[PDB]
């Protein structure tokens, strides 16, 4: 059950889909419909669609409607009268979507054409976000994709992070378990399947493959360093070498250049760098410099 | 009388075209100078 | 599992990609509108694509909206249908981004095309930046770029550092491990391979050429400081000479002028220097001075 | 591994590049706009190349938005798709760079062309510097420079000080390990090497020779004088000759006149010197007026 | 525009001074000095962006540019 994990089939992706819609029900924190004339110009739509013609020269002032826009994913072979779930976000100067019920939403495509129809419940946590919402099978599939999955002899299984050593792997798991020529390598990121033509035995090959389980080989040093939520994460491949660090307020438990023993393994590592007494921004900017001097023999990411 | 052909005040091109740049060195420096005076 | 750590694969590296894009349903902190015009525009733009003319002479102000900057990095050999990270950051005048959802975004390149489409939730740490975000999986690869890779029979592995003596080094493995000509030096960086003609056949050379395992040799001696920061590395290759150093507010542990002992290792250079008793402030200082006299026998860089 | 330590080699060299850039998603510390045009001028031209223009009658007063000048090393024998550091640093006005985000910046060389494309997220300590700030591989190399390494027989090694007694003693090791006439002098800080034709020929002699060991033969006594950090750095080959010294607030531990004895090493100078109980700034008035009498017999210098 | 005030607070206009030594081979670092010229408070964290060094004969021999030290 790895292979699954580590790659994605060719063809089974999903897409985006988006659009706009009211939000009633709200118990006075929806627009204030005077900075945001589109809610009122919509509403005048709908009831005009609806057979009510509200004369032109007129205030509206409402409080329990929020204009929303809806985002949904359109799932790999989606059929109609499927269900998937919706994001909903108000758009402007609106307080809260709490108990609101989303309207009759086309959900239109890169094409800008309608895939979906979404209509429901808003559920919204009540710290928590409240012009932010989700409705469980919100949306009903009212299009489908064409696609060329059963056809042709050959399928690729796409890596999802980009190694020869991991594409090899794969391949020569797949020739180990159904036949000589049965995988190919292509590149670092894509192994190329041969399977039997029509729909139903590729179906049975892709749900033998897509169980197989693979050793994952020891994959690239690399510390990420996120400064925006102030975290540091490294992975078991990362090693260190000998040198002295000196930073602000910080000191031998003496004098302000500590040294950092040779580190071989990830526990050699944290015991080293855990000997600095240093917090996790000072461990920032102490491995940039290390990085930079070449004591840290990992790829440093900023994330 | 304004039919006579006349020598102009200022004589000669009116323009000037450049000249395409020193082919540059190929030592491992982006800073190539031109031929200095 | 070393030469994948220390060199590169020519052809196999990362494009990047940006966008723009508006964030919705936030909790009164967005944008402010009137002095951003184009998060106004833009969605305008977005209301008149989904079937929605507001008026040109109408005064909109949002409060739950904010145009972003998105960026994303386009992976080697990336396919259609797979989903990268993206990074989603404030451009005027916004609060915080921290409940919001990114609408349909283009990634273009360098060269104005449309590679990804961007979509999803933002999760912001909530000290911590609030105008900045990052979604996994939040864009969807949609175009693939052509590549050289399996023509041809050479292939250039492009070391981190510049270095003579790593790049003989990693020749000198790859021809112990695969043969007489395997591996060849081009320049301090750069060393060529020769692989069988083919797709699969390169990944197979590539994959045991990665996890190889190289010493690595001693590099220059280098003290890099971080004077925004604040902090002094020295790596294991840095030598003391035997000088007097004289700073304000230092003496002996007695007289100002301190003597500094001749060092050959790390461990002795550390000693001396914490024999001194100096900040790292006063310690870079210190190190310039000696670096300008010639006691310190290493490359002093300021990053 | 000291002659890699000593010199450099011809041709291996580093380039400077420069670039402009935004920085975003900064919580309000970014510029100011109305003090700064090209912020918003740039900004401007960004949307437009993305689609969207702004008109030109229209106020935009940005907070999350800084414009910032990218600097980076260009290294030798770069290849396309390798990575570099870069160095961020606001341009005006702004506050802070914490959590921002550089979006695509060319960066420049000294004719004008584009050798690394810059686009990362930055690194701010956080006494500190704020508006600075490094992007570990921040930039990719777009550009390669042509070079006439591995043509012809001769390679020059640099010495980083001038020496006829460093320069002869590189040249009679070399001359003592790879043969009679494999290194000749041709000044105080140039030596000559004869290697063989061919690229991979001379990677292999230059190997060789960057990790040889030279005795490093003393060198000419220096004074090194820090007055705007308050520094005194005196070497090993430092002598002194006896005199009388005097100078306000100081007197022997009695009269103002204090004799400092003939020294001929460093201990014995830096003995004499402590026994004046001088502070430093003292000790900076003290060695300059010993130098203009004649009892510091050792070069002077204010850095 | 050439219409337009700009006032910044991170931009100092600096001179900088340098020693060209014997025997210099291009490719080769020399240290330099940076002096802020006119009202300027502070140099502590800066960057001195690329700037010519001329000799004598007002020729470029050499191009500066890194980050500035400052003791404080």
């Known amino acids: 059950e790895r292979i699954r994990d580590l790659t994605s089939v060719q063809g089974v992706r999903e897409n985006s889909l988006i659009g706009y819609g009211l939000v009633v029900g709200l118990d006075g924190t929806g627009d204030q419909t005077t900075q945001t004339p589109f809610t009122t110009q919509t509403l005048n739509n709908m009831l005009s669609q609806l057979g009510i013609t509200v004369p032109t020269g007129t205030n509206m002032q409402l409080k329990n409607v929020a204009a929303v826009m809806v985002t949904a994913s359109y799932p790999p072979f989606a059929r109609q009268g499927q269900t998937i779930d919706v994001v909903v976000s108000s758009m402007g100067n609106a307080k809260s979507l709490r108990g609101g019920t989303l309207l009759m939403t086309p959900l239109k495509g890169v094409d800008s054409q309608v895939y979906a129809l979404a209509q429901g419940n808003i559920l919204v946590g009540g710290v928590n976000q409240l012009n932010g919402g989700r409705i469980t099978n919100g949306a009903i599939i009212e299009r489908e994709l064409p696609t060329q999955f059963g056809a042709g002899n050959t399928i690729n299984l796409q890596l999802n992070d980009e190694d020869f050593t991991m594409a090899q792997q794969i391949t020569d798991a797949i020739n180990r378990a159904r036949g000589y020529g049965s995988a190919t390598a292509l590149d670092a990121r894509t192994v190329q399947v041969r399977v039997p033509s029509g729909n139903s035995s590729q179906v049975r090959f892709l749900a033998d493959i897509q169980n197989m389980e693979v050793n994952v080989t020891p994959q690239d040093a690399k510390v990420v360093i996120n400064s925006r939520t102030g975290s540091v994460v490294m992975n078991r491949e990362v090693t260190l070498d000998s040198c002295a660090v000196a930073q602000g307020n910080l000191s031998v438990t003496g004098g302000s250049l500590q040294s950092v023993r040779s580190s071989a393994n990830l526990n050699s590592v944290v015991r080293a760098l855990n000997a600095l007494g240093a917090t996790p921004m000072d461990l920032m900017s102490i491995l940039q410099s290390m990085q930079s001097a070449g004591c840290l023999r990992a790829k440093l990411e900023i994330i | ?37």
């Open chain 2, 1 to 37: 009388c304004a039919w006579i052909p006349a020598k102009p005040l200022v004589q000669g091109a009116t323009t000037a075209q450049p000249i395409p740049g020193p082919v540059p060195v190929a030592n491992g420096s982006i800073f190539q100078s031109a031929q200095p005076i």
